Amino acid sequence: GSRRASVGSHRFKVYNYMSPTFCDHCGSLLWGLVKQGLKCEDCGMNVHHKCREKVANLCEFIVTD
Amino acid sequence: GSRRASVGSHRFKVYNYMSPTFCDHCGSLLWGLVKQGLKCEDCGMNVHHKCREKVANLCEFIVTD
Ligand SMILES: [Zn+2]
Ligand SMILES: [Zn+2]
Ligand SMILES: [Zn+2]
Ligand SMILES: [Zn+2]
């Protein structure tokens, strides 16, 4: 037996955060009131623009739907 | 880059084939006119009852939605 997972590479898009949000890579605040970072459209990971190139491309999540 | 795949184990359910259909494992006809075998609800693999025991559990398909 195994979980069903969606497995691919991240699909980051510039995101406008409405609440103070931290970088899931480095832990620092996503500064600004708009376009503060990128959110993966698939798994929800949030990263600074500068951290996009520091994260592994692997993007997985468990599918419950 | 990479494709995105849905990955898990097969989820077979007895299926009523409306046209002559073959076992995706062994190649022999799924005999009869109803409940001839099982179809994986995730990837569509068709198997005889007896072949359910023989196939690898791995179930993957490319997501195009
Ligand atoms: Zn992702
Ligand atoms: Zn960061
Ligand atoms: Zn399957
Ligand atoms: Zn068979």
Coordinates of N, CA and C and ligand atoms in Angstrom, one line a residue:
Chain A
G1 N 0.8 -1.2 0.0 CA 0.0 0.0 0.0 C 0.8 1.3 0.0
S2 N 0.4 2.3 -0.7 CA 1.1 3.5 -0.8 C 0.2 4.7 -1.0
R3 N 0.6 5.9 -0.6 CA -0.1 7.1 -0.8 C -0.2 7.5 -2.2
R4 N -1.2 8.2 -2.7 CA -1.2 8.8 -4.0 C -0.6 10.2 -3.8
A5 N 0.4 10.4 -4.6 CA 1.2 11.7 -4.6 C 1.2 12.3 -6.0
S6 N 1.2 13.6 -6.1 CA 1.4 14.3 -7.3 C 2.9 14.7 -7.3
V7 N 3.7 14.3 -8.3 CA 5.1 14.4 -8.3 C 5.6 15.1 -9.6
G8 N 6.3 16.2 -9.4 CA 6.7 17.0 -10.6 C 7.8 17.9 -10.2
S9 N 7.9 19.1 -10.8 CA 8.8 20.2 -10.5 C 7.9 21.4 -10.1
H10 N 8.5 22.2 -9.3 CA 7.7 23.4 -8.8 C 7.3 24.2 -10.0
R11 N 6.2 25.0 -9.8 CA 5.7 25.9 -10.8 C 5.4 27.2 -10.1
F12 N 6.5 28.0 -9.9 CA 6.4 29.2 -9.1 C 5.8 30.4 -9.9
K13 N 5.0 31.1 -9.3 CA 4.4 32.3 -9.8 C 4.5 33.5 -8.8
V14 N 4.8 34.7 -9.3 CA 4.8 35.8 -8.4 C 3.5 35.9 -7.6
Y15 N 3.6 36.2 -6.3 CA 2.4 36.1 -5.5 C 2.3 37.4 -4.7
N16 N 1.1 37.9 -4.4 CA 0.9 39.1 -3.7 C 0.3 38.6 -2.3
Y17 N 1.1 38.6 -1.3 CA 0.7 38.1 0.0 C -0.1 39.1 0.8
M18 N -1.2 38.7 1.4 CA -2.1 39.5 2.1 C -1.8 39.6 3.6
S19 N -1.0 38.7 4.1 CA -0.6 38.6 5.5 C 0.9 38.3 5.5
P20 N 1.5 38.8 6.6 CA 3.0 38.5 6.8 C 3.3 37.0 6.6
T21 N 4.2 36.8 5.7 CA 4.5 35.4 5.3 C 6.0 35.2 5.2
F22 N 6.5 34.1 5.6 CA 7.9 33.8 5.6 C 8.3 33.0 4.4
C23 N 9.6 33.1 4.1 CA 10.2 32.2 3.0 C 10.3 30.8 3.5
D24 N 9.7 29.8 2.8 CA 9.8 28.4 3.2 C 11.2 27.9 3.0
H25 N 12.1 28.6 2.3 CA 13.4 28.2 2.1 C 14.3 28.7 3.2
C26 N 14.4 30.0 3.4 CA 15.4 30.6 4.3 C 14.9 31.1 5.6
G27 N 13.5 31.2 5.7 CA 13.0 31.7 7.0 C 12.8 33.2 7.2
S28 N 13.3 34.0 6.3 CA 13.1 35.4 6.5 C 11.8 35.9 5.9
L29 N 11.3 36.9 6.5 CA 10.0 37.5 6.1 C 10.0 37.8 4.6
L30 N 8.9 37.6 3.9 CA 8.8 38.0 2.5 C 8.4 39.5 2.6
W31 N 9.4 40.4 2.4 CA 9.2 41.8 2.6 C 8.4 42.5 1.6
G32 N 7.7 43.6 1.9 CA 6.9 44.3 1.0 C 5.4 44.1 1.2
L33 N 4.6 44.9 0.5 CA 3.1 44.7 0.6 C 2.6 44.1 -0.7
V34 N 3.4 44.0 -1.7 CA 3.0 43.3 -3.0 C 4.2 42.6 -3.6
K35 N 3.8 41.6 -4.4 CA 4.8 40.8 -5.2 C 6.0 40.4 -4.3
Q36 N 5.7 40.0 -3.0 CA 6.8 39.8 -2.0 C 7.6 38.5 -2.3
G37 N 7.1 37.6 -3.1 CA 7.8 36.4 -3.4 C 7.0 35.6 -4.4
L38 N 7.4 34.3 -4.5 CA 6.7 33.4 -5.4 C 6.1 32.3 -4.7
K39 N 4.9 31.8 -5.2 CA 4.2 30.7 -4.6 C 4.1 29.6 -5.6
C40 N 4.4 28.4 -5.2 CA 4.3 27.3 -6.2 C 2.8 27.0 -6.4
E41 N 2.3 27.0 -7.6 CA 0.9 26.8 -7.9 C 0.5 25.4 -7.6
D42 N 1.4 24.5 -7.5 CA 1.1 23.1 -7.2 C 1.1 22.7 -5.7
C43 N 2.2 23.1 -5.0 CA 2.4 22.6 -3.6 C 2.3 23.7 -2.6
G44 N 2.2 25.0 -3.0 CA 2.0 26.1 -2.1 C 3.3 26.7 -1.5
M45 N 4.5 26.1 -1.8 CA 5.7 26.6 -1.3 C 5.9 28.1 -1.6
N46 N 6.3 28.9 -0.6 CA 6.6 30.3 -0.7 C 8.0 30.6 -0.7
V47 N 8.6 31.4 -1.6 CA 10.0 31.7 -1.6 C 10.3 33.1 -2.0
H48 N 11.3 33.7 -1.4 CA 11.8 35.0 -2.0 C 12.2 34.8 -3.4
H49 N 12.2 35.9 -4.2 CA 12.7 35.8 -5.5 C 14.1 35.3 -5.5
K50 N 15.0 35.8 -4.6 CA 16.4 35.3 -4.6 C 16.5 33.9 -4.2
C51 N 15.5 33.3 -3.5 CA 15.6 31.9 -3.0 C 15.1 30.9 -4.0
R52 N 14.4 31.4 -5.1 CA 13.9 30.5 -6.1 C 15.0 29.6 -6.7
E53 N 16.2 30.2 -6.9 CA 17.3 29.4 -7.4 C 18.1 28.6 -6.4
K54 N 17.6 28.6 -5.1 CA 18.3 27.9 -4.1 C 17.6 26.6 -3.7
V55 N 16.3 26.5 -4.1 CA 15.5 25.4 -3.7 C 15.6 24.3 -4.8
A56 N 15.4 23.0 -4.3 CA 15.4 21.9 -5.2 C 14.1 22.0 -6.1
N57 N 14.2 21.5 -7.3 CA 13.0 21.6 -8.1 C 11.9 20.6 -7.8
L58 N 12.3 19.5 -7.1 CA 11.3 18.5 -6.7 C 10.1 19.1 -6.0
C59 N 8.9 18.7 -6.6 CA 7.6 19.2 -6.0 C 6.7 18.1 -5.9
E60 N 6.4 17.7 -4.7 CA 5.5 16.6 -4.4 C 4.5 17.0 -3.3
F61 N 3.3 16.4 -3.5 CA 2.3 16.6 -2.4 C 1.3 15.4 -2.4
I62 N 0.8 15.1 -1.3 CA -0.2 14.0 -1.2 C -1.5 14.4 -1.7
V63 N -2.2 13.6 -2.6 CA -3.5 14.0 -3.1 C -4.6 13.3 -2.3
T64 N -5.4 14.1 -1.7 CA -6.5 13.6 -0.9 C -7.9 13.7 -1.6
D65 N -7.9 14.4 -2.8 CA -9.1 14.6 -3.6 C -9.3 13.4 -4.5
Chain B
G1 N 13.5 20.5 -16.1 CA 12.0 20.4 -16.0 C 11.6 19.0 -16.0
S2 N 10.3 18.8 -15.6 CA 9.7 17.5 -15.6 C 8.2 17.5 -15.8
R3 N 7.7 16.3 -16.3 CA 6.3 16.1 -16.3 C 5.8 16.0 -14.9
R4 N 4.5 16.2 -14.7 CA 3.9 15.9 -13.4 C 3.1 14.6 -13.5
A5 N 3.3 13.7 -12.5 CA 2.7 12.4 -12.6 C 1.9 12.2 -11.3
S6 N 0.8 11.5 -11.4 CA 0.1 11.0 -10.3 C 0.6 9.6 -10.0
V7 N 1.1 9.4 -8.8 CA 1.8 8.2 -8.4 C 1.2 7.5 -7.2
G8 N 1.0 6.2 -7.3 CA 0.5 5.5 -6.1 C 0.5 4.0 -6.5
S9 N -0.4 3.3 -6.0 CA -0.6 1.9 -6.3 C -2.0 1.7 -7.0
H10 N -2.1 0.6 -7.8 CA -3.3 0.5 -8.6 C -4.5 0.4 -7.6
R11 N -5.7 0.8 -8.2 CA -7.0 0.7 -7.4 C -8.0 0.0 -8.4
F12 N -7.9 -1.3 -8.4 CA -8.7 -2.1 -9.4 C -10.1 -2.3 -8.9
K13 N -11.1 -2.2 -9.9 CA -12.5 -2.4 -9.6 C -13.1 -3.2 -10.8
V14 N -14.0 -4.2 -10.5 CA -14.6 -5.0 -11.5 C -15.3 -4.1 -12.5
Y15 N -15.1 -4.4 -13.8 CA -15.6 -3.5 -14.8 C -16.3 -4.3 -15.9
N16 N -17.4 -3.7 -16.5 CA -18.1 -4.3 -17.6 C -17.7 -3.7 -18.9
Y17 N -16.9 -4.5 -19.6 CA -16.3 -4.1 -20.9 C -17.4 -4.3 -22.0
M18 N -17.6 -3.2 -22.7 CA -18.7 -3.2 -23.8 C -18.2 -3.7 -25.1
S19 N -16.9 -3.8 -25.2 CA -16.2 -4.3 -26.5 C -15.2 -5.3 -26.1
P20 N -14.8 -6.2 -27.0 CA -13.8 -7.2 -26.6 C -12.5 -6.5 -26.2
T21 N -12.0 -6.9 -25.0 CA -10.9 -6.2 -24.4 C -9.9 -7.3 -23.9
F22 N -8.6 -6.9 -24.0 CA -7.6 -7.8 -23.6 C -6.9 -7.5 -22.3
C23 N -6.4 -8.4 -21.6 CA -5.7 -8.2 -20.3 C -4.4 -7.5 -20.7
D24 N -4.2 -6.3 -20.0 CA -2.9 -5.5 -20.2 C -1.7 -6.2 -19.6
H25 N -1.9 -7.2 -18.8 CA -0.8 -8.0 -18.2 C -0.4 -9.1 -19.1
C26 N -1.3 -10.0 -19.4 CA -1.0 -11.3 -20.0 C -1.3 -11.4 -21.5
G27 N -2.2 -10.5 -22.0 CA -2.5 -10.5 -23.4 C -3.7 -11.3 -23.9
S28 N -4.2 -12.2 -23.0 CA -5.4 -13.0 -23.3 C -6.6 -12.2 -23.2
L29 N -7.6 -12.5 -24.0 CA -9.0 -11.9 -23.9 C -9.6 -11.9 -22.5
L30 N -10.2 -10.8 -22.1 CA -11.0 -10.8 -20.9 C -12.3 -11.4 -21.3
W31 N -12.5 -12.7 -21.0 CA -13.5 -13.6 -21.5 C -14.9 -13.1 -21.0
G32 N -15.9 -13.3 -21.9 CA -17.3 -13.0 -21.5 C -17.8 -11.6 -21.9
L33 N -19.0 -11.3 -21.5 CA -19.7 -10.1 -21.9 C -19.9 -9.1 -20.8
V34 N -19.7 -9.6 -19.6 CA -19.8 -8.7 -18.4 C -18.8 -9.1 -17.3
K35 N -18.5 -8.1 -16.4 CA -17.6 -8.3 -15.3 C -16.4 -9.2 -15.7
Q36 N -15.8 -8.9 -16.9 CA -14.8 -9.7 -17.5 C -13.5 -9.6 -16.8
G37 N -13.3 -8.5 -16.1 CA -12.0 -8.2 -15.4 C -12.1 -7.0 -14.6
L38 N -10.9 -6.4 -14.2 CA -10.9 -5.2 -13.4 C -10.2 -4.1 -14.1
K39 N -10.6 -2.9 -13.9 CA -10.0 -1.7 -14.5 C -9.5 -0.9 -13.3
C40 N -8.2 -0.4 -13.4 CA -7.7 0.5 -12.4 C -8.4 1.8 -12.5
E41 N -9.0 2.3 -11.4 CA -9.7 3.5 -11.4 C -8.9 4.7 -11.6
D42 N -7.5 4.6 -11.4 CA -6.6 5.7 -11.6 C -5.9 5.7 -13.0
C43 N -5.4 4.6 -13.5 CA -4.6 4.6 -14.7 C -5.3 3.9 -15.9
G44 N -6.4 3.2 -15.6 CA -7.1 2.5 -16.7 C -6.6 1.1 -17.0
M45 N -5.6 0.6 -16.4 CA -5.1 -0.8 -16.7 C -6.2 -1.8 -16.5
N46 N -6.3 -2.7 -17.5 CA -7.3 -3.8 -17.5 C -6.6 -5.1 -17.2
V47 N -7.2 -5.9 -16.2 CA -6.6 -7.2 -15.9 C -7.6 -8.2 -15.6
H48 N -7.2 -9.5 -15.9 CA -8.0 -10.6 -15.4 C -8.0 -10.6 -13.9
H49 N -9.0 -11.2 -13.3 CA -9.0 -11.4 -11.9 C -7.7 -12.1 -11.5
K50 N -7.3 -13.2 -12.2 CA -6.1 -13.9 -11.8 C -4.8 -13.1 -12.0
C51 N -4.9 -12.1 -12.9 CA -3.7 -11.3 -13.2 C -3.5 -10.1 -12.2
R52 N -4.6 -9.8 -11.4 CA -4.5 -8.8 -10.4 C -3.3 -9.2 -9.4
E53 N -3.1 -10.5 -9.2 CA -2.1 -11.0 -8.3 C -0.7 -10.9 -8.9
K54 N -0.6 -10.7 -10.2 CA 0.7 -10.8 -10.9 C 1.3 -9.4 -11.3
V55 N 0.5 -8.4 -11.3 CA 1.0 -7.1 -11.8 C 1.7 -6.4 -10.6
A56 N 2.7 -5.6 -11.0 CA 3.4 -4.7 -10.0 C 2.3 -3.7 -9.5
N57 N 2.5 -3.3 -8.3 CA 1.5 -2.4 -7.7 C 1.6 -1.0 -8.2
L58 N 2.8 -0.6 -8.7 CA 3.1 0.8 -9.1 C 2.1 1.3 -10.2
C59 N 1.5 2.4 -9.8 CA 0.5 3.0 -10.7 C 0.8 4.5 -10.9
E60 N 1.2 4.8 -12.1 CA 1.5 6.2 -12.5 C 0.9 6.6 -13.8
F61 N 0.5 7.9 -13.8 CA 0.1 8.5 -15.1 C 0.4 9.9 -15.1
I62 N 0.7 10.5 -16.3 CA 1.0 11.9 -16.5 C -0.3 12.7 -16.4
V63 N -0.2 13.8 -15.6 CA -1.3 14.7 -15.4 C -1.4 15.8 -16.5
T64 N -2.5 15.8 -17.2 CA -2.6 16.8 -18.3 C -3.7 17.8 -17.9
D65 N -4.3 17.7 -16.8 CA -5.3 18.6 -16.3 C -4.7 19.7 -15.4
Ligands
ZN1 ZN 5.8 23.0 -5.7
ZN2 ZN 14.2 33.2 1.3
ZN3 ZN -3.3 1.9 -12.0
ZN4 ZN -4.4 -11.7 -17.8

